[PDB]
Design a protein around this nucleic acid. Structure first.
Length: 95
RNA sequence: AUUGAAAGUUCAAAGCUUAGAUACCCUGGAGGGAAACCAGACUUAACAC
């Protein structure tokens, strides 16, 4: 919290209340009312990434990039449609 | 008014002497310091555009 960009804006794009323009709302992420999930998302240093990439090969010389997103339990019924074709676009741009 | 009357079973006297709770006898037998556990998580900032 130094130069505004965290102030509200990203707190807004994570409110489980408060709007639906962001397809992802963290369960208890509250506007200035951070109790647990706020600190966990913003302060807990050891958090794995949900977006993950893998590379496979077979006995043939075929190789594939899997990109997947594990579903978490702090998403308040995430919009599975917006992030889905974000992932195809990411998987394209990196290959 | 009697086969009666009278008469202390009394005196002296150490349950003492000798004598080893000793002899033989393994705290031993059986029993796994093991069981579980990711050396891992993540990039961010600055200005230029």
């Amino acid at each position: 919290k130094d130069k505004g960009l965290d102030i509200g804006f990203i707190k807004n794009y994570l409110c489980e209340t408060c709007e639906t323009v962001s397809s992802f709302n963290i369960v208890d992420f509250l506007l200035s009312e951070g109790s647990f999930m706020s600190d966990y998302i913003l302060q807990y240093e050891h958090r794995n990434s949900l977006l993950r990439f893998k590379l496979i090969s077979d006995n043939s010389n075929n190789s594939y990039l899997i990109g997947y997103i594990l579903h978490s339990s702090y998403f308040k019924k995430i919009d599975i449609k917006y992030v889905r074709c974000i992932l195809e676009k990411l998987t394209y741009c990196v290959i």
